[PDB]
Amino acid sequence: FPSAVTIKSWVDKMQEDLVTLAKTASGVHQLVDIYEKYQDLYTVEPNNARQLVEIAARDIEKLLSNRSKALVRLALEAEKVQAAHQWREDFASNEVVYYNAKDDLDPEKNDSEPGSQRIKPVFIDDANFRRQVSYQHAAVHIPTDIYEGSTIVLNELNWTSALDDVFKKNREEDPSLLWQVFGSATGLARYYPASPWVDNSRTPNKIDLYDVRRRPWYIQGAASPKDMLILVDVSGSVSGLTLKLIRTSVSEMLETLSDDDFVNVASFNSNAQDVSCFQHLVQANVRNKKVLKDAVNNITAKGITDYKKGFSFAFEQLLNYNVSRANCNKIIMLFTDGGEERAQEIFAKYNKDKKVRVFTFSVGQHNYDRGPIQWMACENKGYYYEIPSIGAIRINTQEYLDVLGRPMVLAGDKAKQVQWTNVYLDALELGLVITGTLPVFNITGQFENKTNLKNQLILGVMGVDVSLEDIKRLTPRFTLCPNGYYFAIDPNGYVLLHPNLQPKPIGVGIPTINLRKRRPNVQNPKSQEPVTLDFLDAELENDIKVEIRNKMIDGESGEKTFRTLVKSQDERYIDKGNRTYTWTPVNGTDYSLALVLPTYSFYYIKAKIEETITQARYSETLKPDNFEESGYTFLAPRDYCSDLKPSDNNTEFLLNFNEFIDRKTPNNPSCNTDLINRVLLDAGFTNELVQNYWSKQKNIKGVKARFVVTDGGITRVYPKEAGENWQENPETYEDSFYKRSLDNDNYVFTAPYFNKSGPGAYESGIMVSKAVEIYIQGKLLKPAVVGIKIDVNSWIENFTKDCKRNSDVMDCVILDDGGFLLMANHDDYTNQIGRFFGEIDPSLMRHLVNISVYAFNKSYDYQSVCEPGAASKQSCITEQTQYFFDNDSKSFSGVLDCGNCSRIFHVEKLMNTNLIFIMVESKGTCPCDTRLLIQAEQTSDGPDPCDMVKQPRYRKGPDVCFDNNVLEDYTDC
Amino acid sequence: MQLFGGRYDFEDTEVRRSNFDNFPQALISVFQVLTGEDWNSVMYNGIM
Numbered sequence A: 001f002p003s004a005v006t007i008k009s010w011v012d013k014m015q016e017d018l019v020t021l022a023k024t025a026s027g028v029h030q031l032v033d034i035y036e037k038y039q040d041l042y043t044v045e046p047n048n049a050r051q052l053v054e055i056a057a058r059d060i061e062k063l064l065s066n067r068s069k070a071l072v073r074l075a076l077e078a079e080k081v082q083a084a085h086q087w088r089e090d091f092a093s094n095e096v097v098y099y100n101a102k103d104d105l106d107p108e109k110n111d112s113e114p115g116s117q118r119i120k121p122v123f124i125d126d127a128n129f130r131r132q133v134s135y136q137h138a139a140v141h142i143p144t145d146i147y148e149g150s151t152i153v154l155n156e157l158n159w160t161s162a163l164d165d166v167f168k169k170n171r172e173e174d175p176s177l178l179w180q181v182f183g184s185a186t187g188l189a190r191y192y193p194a195s196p197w198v199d200n201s202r203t204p205n206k207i208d209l210y211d212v213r214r215r216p217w218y219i220q221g222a223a224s225p226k227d228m229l230i231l232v233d234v235s236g237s238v239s240g241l242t243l244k245l246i247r248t249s250v251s252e253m254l255e256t257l258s259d260d261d262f263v264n265v266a267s268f269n270s271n272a273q274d275v276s277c278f279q280h281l282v283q284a285n286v287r288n289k290k291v292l293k294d295a296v297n298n299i300t301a302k303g304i305t306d307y308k309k310g311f312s313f314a315f316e317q318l319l320n321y322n323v324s325r326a327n328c329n330k331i332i333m334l335f336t337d338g339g340e341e342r343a344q345e346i347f348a349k350y351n352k353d354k355k356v357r358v359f360t361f362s363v364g365q366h367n368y369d370r371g372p373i374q375w376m377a378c379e380n381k382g383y384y385y386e387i388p389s390i391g392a393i394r395i396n397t398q399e400y401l402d403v404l405g406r407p408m409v410l411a412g413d414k415a416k417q418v419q420w421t422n423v424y425l426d427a428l429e430l431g432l433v434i435t436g437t438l439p440v441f442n443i444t445g446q447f448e449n450k451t452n453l454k455n456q457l458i459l460g461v462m463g464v465d466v467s468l469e470d471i472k473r474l475t476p477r478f479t480l481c482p483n484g485y486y487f488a489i490d491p492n493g494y495v496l497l498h499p500n501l502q503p504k505p506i507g508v509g510i511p512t513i514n515l516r517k518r519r520p521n522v523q524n525p526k527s528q529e530p531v532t533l534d535f536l537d538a539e540l541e542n543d544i545k546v547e548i549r550n551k552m553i554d555g556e557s558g559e560k561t562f563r564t565l566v567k568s569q570d571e572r573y574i575d576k577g578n579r580t581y582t583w584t585p586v587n588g589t590d591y592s593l594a595l596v597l598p599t600y601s602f603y604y605i606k607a608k609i610e611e612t613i614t615q616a617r618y619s620e621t622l623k624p625d626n627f628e629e630s631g632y633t634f635l636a637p638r639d640y641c642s643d644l645k646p647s648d649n650n651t652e653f654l655l656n657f658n659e660f661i662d663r664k665t666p667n668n669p670s671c672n673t674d675l676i677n678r679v680l681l682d683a684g685f686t687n688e689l690v691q692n693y694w695s696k697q698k699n700i701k702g703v704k705a706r707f708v709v710t711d712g713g714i715t716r717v718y719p720k721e722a723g724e725n726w727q728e729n730p731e732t733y734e735d736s737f738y739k740r741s742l743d744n745d746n747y748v749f750t751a752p753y754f755n756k757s758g759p760g761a762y763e764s765g766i767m768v769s770k771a772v773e774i775y776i777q778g779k780l781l782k783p784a785v786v787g788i789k790i791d792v793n794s795w796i797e798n799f800t801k802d803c804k805r806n807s808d809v810m811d812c813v814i815l816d817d818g819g820f821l822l823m824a825n826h827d828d829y830t831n832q833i834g835r836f837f838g839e840i841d842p843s844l845m846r847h848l849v850n851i852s853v854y855a856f857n858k859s860y861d862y863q864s865v866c867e868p869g870a871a872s873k874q875s876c877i878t879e880q881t882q883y884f885f886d887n888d889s890k891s892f893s894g895v896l897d898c899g900n901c902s903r904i905f906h907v908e909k910l911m912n913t914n915l916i917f918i919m920v921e922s923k924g925t926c927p928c929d930t931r932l933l934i935q936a937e938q939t940s941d942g943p944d945p946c947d948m949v950k951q952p953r954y955r956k957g958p959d960v961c962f963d964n965n966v967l968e969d970y971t972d973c
Numbered sequence B: 001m002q003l004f005g006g007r008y009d010f011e012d013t014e015v016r017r018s019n020f021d022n023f024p025q026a027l028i029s030v031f032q033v034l035t036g037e038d039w040n041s042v043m044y045n046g047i048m
Ligand SMILES: *[C@@H]1O[C@H](CO)[C@@H](O[C@@H]2O[C@H](CO)[C@@H](O[C@@H]3O[C@H](CO)[C@@H](O)[C@H](O)[C@H]3NC(C)=O)[C@H](O)[C@H]2NC(C)=O)[C@H](O)[C@H]1NC(C)=O
Pocket: A017, A020, A021, A024, A025, A700, A701, A702, A703, A794, A798
């Protein structure tokens, strides 16, 4: 075996050759010099991490206050208009004129429904609405199973019409408003502007299941956070249809709970016990609700009924106070059929003060006595419901919120506070939005106090949508580093704004489907859950990030600098870099805003170009006519002006940009001059580099293509023949190699992908990049990243010319930090370049991760596409693994044994590069193989959710809530 | 009532009115079998 001195000499020669190749081909020092040669076309401006967050927080607060102003107007006008409603009964004389959505657009429909007159809108297209909308009137959505033309419905359409004027006034005051909707307690929904419903009734094979009463914003604004305990009867007599209906009803009731509510499901048959592994109230987020649903769809009916034991168990669980709780609305929901014992002594013993509401449900068709459960219902300030079939479940499992809102109504003007929901997906296909809610009270005879009977219920909820794109426009990122970003958090740990939050729904568990019980024409529901992603689930969890998150949850402002592990844009690498977190609270709301800025990013380049001819020359520079001369150019689709729009097509976007800058003057009366000036300056600098340096040596032996990517959005690949091989995002802020090069302080090798269609193995080459570092006045700046694509074959010749071609004695390979193969020694691994080393040599890879030359760690991705198994595409959790170097040590030596074998290895690390050199005896020396070490997205279901509830994350629930009012009547059941 | 009493706990939504859940319904079912009208459905329910 060759000794250490020989291998040090060999790897030193290889690293020197590669470093010289990259340095003298890319031209890092040339770009550095031309950046430092001018120092007059731009100025270096600080990025104050404190002022920026204050400015952004104030802008967000002002936007949300603006949105809340349009809510109080709607609420007051609706209350005033409804107070003076007449309630007629004969509508066939004076029809009701309204535009019913989810109706056909044919003028020849000839509806002629008695009591209603239709409207045919014009439906111009619109922006900020990726639909066609009409601003003249408001649309009305009525659920499919609710008949329009009822006396109840026709009266709502009669008085709610008065809201269109307020809708239009709200729009004309602020033209950036999204949907404004009134959700009625009768199932109606009147929203503005008018737009056809996404899913009409039965023109296709599909139907819609949209009741406004079950939407997250309505449920949030209709009552306060709950402490629910579902008590299920699993005695013998519920066997049959009533057990199946009980299971479905419990699932539907769970569907109405949010993250501020705490729930647990228990069952009783001569003995009370929990249905799952929780044993107390839990947060009722997506995962815990999924666990409860799974446990509920497993209960069987056997035994003798005993209400006293069940109610004792439920009350004791409601009296815990050892755990996190909403601590507002302690309620018990009993799912039974009928009995004979009312258990007066239990209610006297446990809630003689009536601090707990008891809602009772009679499920199924049966002959058992229902009097006792009605008495249980409307003795303890509750209500009584009957669920005889499946069609009754949806409407009966949601009406308990009418009772819970009575104290909120009796509170008066104290309860008219604006609340903002979690991030969810808009029902009209607008993206991720949040809604601000405000309840509307019924005040008839308020000045005379006549009835006050139906005045204890709310009329409905007003809502205003704010898209996450609206908030992101107030946190600009193009003066920051590609590694810098904003993110905002709830007083629940959930991210309002984060780079890793995606429009996909949050996945839970593993998606299991049965294709053999799937009728083709049934229109099954898709999803209704909100996109709640915790802050610790959006980045890598750390012991300091938890402290920072806890500190910014409870309304505190501070700053922090620490070392952290940064996952790359594509989940294949992990980098260690300094980051600074600056956070402040948003005053008006409960959100908290933080700005993540690395070092080397406290100063940015602000262009000071003022010569029109130079601007014109820089502009004509990035013209497609001379892509042969100055290199193929890409442009980042940023919002330079409101007229030209990005279009996911870089050639025609560049054409539009060129004609836009050349046709009208770059004075830009309504466009962003800073972005345009930066783009022009960077284009000029990159072209100067290309013409002066890259063009001199048109052909280089080992170099396939040379690229430069700069801040501003200019990318240049010198050989036009290499342009169509460039598969990187035109936006420089989304290029993984760019950010990796920014973090590291040396040359970075990016292994090509494997099993991907297109030229990526030999016709593209290996990519090496380095970040350009300039010094203007002793301040760090990393504006651009240069690099080259090196020939695979030329590198092979460099390598072979012991370590000999197709050697049957020794294996010599090169890996990057991440275990991806970049250079083999036998031409069988070489063909499968770009694979994880554990896919081809699992034993050595496992030993390497064991000797602590490779460090690895795992994370969960809660927004992934998953293929359903047997037990199109669905959403689930995938576990991601990334490998990275651990110590600074360079040389490691040892022997690994697998079944009385002996393979000697000696890994060596290349200086000033993220590569590593490994030599080992051939796999044919010892035919041993335990199992492959997979590095890929693996479909998963963890973590275990009923071990997190024992030590849950820090949380801060709402502090103001309304329950237990003396004036409440509670004589209804 | 002794044989098929409370044993019609079928999970499906389909309704079977002729059962033996209480004395009047058992009398009606026995009388219906006696007249012979549609007694095969009663037999099938008892078998299942
Ligand atoms: C591994 O491959 C490399 C490229 O694929 C080869 O690198 C070439 O080595 C030549 C010999 O040293 C260099 O020539 C030198 O170039 C510099 C400036 O370019 C001149 O100042 C030197 O005078 C000149 N050498 C002489 C003797 O005149 C090539 O420049 C260099 N290629 C590049 C792109 O830089 C390696 O040679 C090869 N490894 C081995 C072991 O051969």
